[PDB]
């Protein structure tokens, strides 16, 4: 197949997630305009522009209806998909860095602290504020997201740490030194019952969420920032633009960022497809098992 890459942004794409039906992919980006694209054929429906700073994250709900962006502009934004009009505006005190929905839509995660946000749809309110904050404990949480039905939260951290959250007590459990660098993105599995964390420390991992034992490492010779689990197919994606394991990393004119095909359980790389023009910043997979996604420093999402 043909991958349609849309490069409608002049600054870095920041997070990708596919929706449940997957005809839409939701993306927020380092340029103040987030964007919503039809994933089926790559036509861009529109852009989400009510933010005034880099929007770090987006995730699309279980209904595939609305997309939201969170930003460093001191705001959190919920967006109308038909016209891109800001209908309400909420201020935030910090950048929201990673997003991932609870399975029921009644709860939402936010990465600040580790924030927990309730959505009480019965009350006609998308809350301006998070419903809970888990404050930091010796480090800083770069990325965080809510597992299935809000049961556990899996966070990857700037210090190479992993964190674990107890939904019934609302707090963080423990970390271990593993990696040497910042976590750039985090996206949940398709059923959200287990999760993988990612970091820019040149290691990628497949991890159990439930035990916190290091279960698996997925190898590329490049730091991977984002992966998503595809419905209809058992896959892992490994990602870099610049090789990321040398100083003075350099690119070719062609665009050396390549889509990499991996086994989710068994971990091996079996081939590559080039085409993206930056480090992978974001990844989403189609609900039909038909696509994978790369987020570039050029701002594009490519669905393949």
């Amino acid at each position: 197949m043909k991958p349609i890459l849309l490069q409608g942004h002049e600054r870095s794409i920041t997070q990708i997630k596919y929706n449940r039906e997957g005809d839409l992919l939701f993306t927020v980006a380092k340029d103040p305009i987030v964007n919503v694209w039809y994933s089926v054929n790559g036509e861009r429906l529109g852009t989400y522009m009510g933010h005034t700073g880099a929007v770090w994250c987006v995730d699309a709900d279980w209904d595939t209806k609305h997309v939201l962006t969170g930003s460093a502009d001191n705001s959190c934004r919920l967006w109308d998909c038909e016209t891109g009009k800001q209908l309400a505006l909420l201020k935030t005190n910090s950048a929201v860095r990673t997003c991932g929905f609870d399975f029921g839509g009644n709860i939402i995660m936010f990465s600040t602290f580790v924030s927990f946000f309730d959505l009480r749809d019965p009350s006609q309110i998308d809350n301006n504020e998070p419903y809970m904050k888990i404050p930091c404990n010796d480090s800083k949480i770069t990325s965080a997201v809510w597992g299935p039905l809000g049961e556990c939260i899996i966070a990857g951290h700037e210090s190479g740490e992993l964190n674990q959250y107890s939904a019934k007590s609302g707090e963080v459990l423990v970390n271990v030194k593993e990696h040497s660098r910042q976590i750039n993105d985090i996206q949940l599995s398709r059923d959200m019952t287990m999760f993988v964390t990612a970091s820019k420390d040149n290691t990628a991992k497949l991890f159990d969420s439930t035990t916190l034992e290091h279960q698996k490492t997925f190898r590329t010779e490049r730091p991977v920032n984002s992966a998503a689990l595809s419905p209809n197919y058992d896959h892992v994606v490994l990602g870099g633009g610049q090789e990321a394991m040398d100083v003075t990393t350099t690119s070719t004119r062609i665009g050396k960022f390549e889509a990499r095909f991996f086994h989710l359980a068994f971990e091996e790389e079996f081939g590559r497809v080039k085409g993206h023009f930056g480090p992978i910043n974001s990844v989403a997979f189609h609900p039909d098992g038909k696509s994978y996604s790369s987020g570039g420093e050029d701002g594009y999402v490519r669905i393949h």
């Binding site: 991996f262 086994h263 359980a265 068994f266 091996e268 079996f270």
Partner: protein, 588 residues
């Protein structure tokens, strides 16, 4: 003039003297008759000044020698006027000073050398050598943006040769796979080979349609654009092999283009001009002096596909029965006349060995007329069907045939056989199908009992040795159905040029089931290129026709090994990488 072989000078001549043909000759009363008709040759020479009448030693002359006020205006003189008022026997001719010993230039001294062999090596020779199947079908994607010639798709290869703008307009392959033809504004290109090299190119600006002679002497080109080089025409004929122009021909009404029908062997051809026949012999592009091939009052015609016999259908006159005609090709005499009454419509259906002809007679009681052409005196067996036949299909090369009749929800398939003892039989009825089309395998039995089925796969299959349904293809894409020339592939495909529910070509086995599909971007035309069987040895064909048992070697394991080796580890290096990939599926 008076001479039974009268002609003028054979070339243009000296510039200073005018030649007048049918001129104002010496002698009483004959002179003033062409006094003006030779003032045609001399009228655009200015005022005619002297037109001296030469006499051919006192016999009555047709020609005189002429001069003008300007000598060098003779080149102008013979174009601005012809046919000035005339009496007696002279009119309409002009020239310059009676030139002679004319000359012609033409290709000579044939040596084939270069350009003879790329086309031939690729197909029907390498094809026979090739051991895979699916007929090495070519490929067309995105309306000629990518044009591909391909090898057999059962094996690892698909694509044999692919080029951009190889075929700007549509596609065409020859009936034996030797050539592939392409259409373009500048003309036609013939393509052939494993690498699909250019075989022949015919430069013909704005050619709108083409055909190729069965024996490859002639290329037929049809255009709605008219050219004037040959007589007023909208159709060019080219020699296909050499690129040489053989003939040009007029078309009065371009309704359909099977205008030049060919003999079974391709040796002779027939062509209609309105209600008149013009016969061009296929071998020579020559007129047939056979009396029937200039016949008046025929109304429809076609050839035998295996016997070279001519057939004519003439609808019934007010008092005289309609009559079907069998004219042999050279003797031109009647072997069989079929007079029947109350005929409404007639369609001619031939069998592929040319042993039998079925006439579909409409009387409404449809009648089939089956002619035992091989048995002496051609006895005709009539099959009286009763219920509105909508299809007929012969068993290829056999004495069995298949028909479809009736209402679409209750359409009945009936398979028929003709026997050595004369008596016809219905072998089996297969009722209540949606079939309206038949694509039999070239090898016999495998008759595709299936309708158009466009976007609604209602296709079915009937084999004819046992009247058994082998397999069903549910392909919505299928709209056309054809079997490979080898008889080992039946392709069900869809055209994005035609419709938009599928856009692909599927390469399948002729057994009866679609295997897998290679999608085509706009699917202008997808066709199995022919691997047409030219010949066989009966003794080699007989009994086992293998080296040992089944097919060739008794083991037949030479190609069978690949399935188990490649699946576990395709090349060992590819394996360890990709072994994980679907180890993951089960485990995760």
């Amino acid at each position: 003039g008076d001479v039974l072989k009268d002609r003028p000078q054979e070339a243009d001549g000296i510039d200073s003297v005018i030649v007048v043909d049918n001129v104002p000759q010496v002698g009483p009363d004959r002179l003033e008759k062409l006094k003006n008709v030779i003032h045609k040759i001399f009228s655009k020479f200015g005022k005619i000044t002297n037109d001296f009448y030469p006499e051919e030693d006192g016999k009555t002359k047709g020609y005189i020698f002429l001069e003008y006020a300007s000598p060098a205006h003779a080149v102008d003189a013979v174009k601005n006027a012809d046919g000035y008022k005339l009496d007696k026997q002279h009119t309409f001719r002009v020239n310059l000073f009676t030139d002679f010993d004319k000359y012609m230039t033409i290709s000579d001294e044939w040596d084939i050398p270069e350009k003879q062999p790329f086309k031939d090596l690729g197909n029907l020779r390498y094809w026979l050598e090739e051991a895979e199947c699916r007929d090495q079908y070519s490929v067309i994607f995105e309306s000629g943006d990518r044009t591909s010639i391909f090898w057999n798709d059962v094996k690892d290869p698909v694509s044999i040769e692919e080029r951009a703008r190889w075929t700007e307009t549509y596609v065409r392959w020859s009936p034996k796979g030797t050539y592939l033809a392409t259409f373009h504004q500048r003309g036609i290109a013939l393509w052939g080979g494993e690498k699909f090299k250019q075989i022949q190119r015919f430069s013909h600006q704005g050619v709108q349609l083409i055909d190729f002679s069965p024996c490859e002497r002639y290329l037929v080109t049809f255009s709605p654009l008219m050219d004037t080089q040959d007589d007023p025409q909208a159709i060019i004929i080219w020699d296909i092999l050499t690129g040489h122009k053989k003939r040009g021909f007029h078309c009065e009404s371009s309704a359909h283009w099977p205008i030049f029908k060919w003999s079974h062997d391709g040796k002779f051809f027939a062509r209609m001009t309105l209600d008149t026949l013009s016969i061009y012999e296929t071998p020579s592009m020559g007129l047939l002096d056979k009396k029937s091939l200039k016949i008046s009052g025929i109304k429809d015609f076609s050839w035998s596909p295996g016997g070279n016999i001519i057939a004519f259908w003439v609808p019934e006159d007010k008092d005289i029965p309609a009559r079907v005609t069998l004219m042999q090709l050279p003797t031109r005499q009647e072997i069989r006349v079929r007079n029947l009454f109350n005929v409404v419509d007639c369609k001619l259906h031939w069998q592929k060995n040319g042993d039998y002809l079925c006439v579909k007679v409409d009387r409404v009681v449809t009648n089939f007329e089956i002619f035992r052409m091989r048995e002496k005196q051609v006895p005709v067996d009539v099959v009286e069907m009763k219920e509105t036949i909508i299809a007929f299909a012969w068993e290829p090369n056999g004495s069995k045939f298949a028909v479809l009749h009736g209402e679409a929800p209750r359409i009945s398939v009936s398979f028929y056989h003709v026997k050595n003892n004369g008596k016809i039989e219905l072998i089996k009825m297969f009722d209540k199908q949606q079939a309206n089309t038949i694509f039999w395998s070239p090898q016999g039995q495998f008759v595709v009992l299936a309708g158009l089925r466009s976007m609604n796969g209602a296709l079915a299959f009937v084999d004819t040795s046992d009247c058994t349904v082998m397999n069903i293809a549910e392909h919505y894409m299928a709209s056309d159905v054809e079997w490979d020339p080898t008889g080992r592939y039946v392709v069900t495909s869809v055209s994005w040029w035609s419709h938009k529910v599928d856009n692909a070509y599927w390469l399948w086995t002729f057994q009866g089931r679609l295997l897998q599909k290679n999608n085509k971007d706009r699917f202008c035309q997808l066709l199995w290129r022919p691997r047409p069987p030219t010949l066989l040895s009966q003794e080699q064909i007989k009994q086992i026709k293998k080296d040992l048992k089944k097919y060739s070697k008794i083991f037949e394991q030479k190609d069978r090994l690949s399935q188990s080796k490649a699946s576990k580890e395709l090349v060992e290096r590819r394996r360890t990488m990709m072994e994980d990939f679907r180890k993951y599926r089960k485990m995760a």
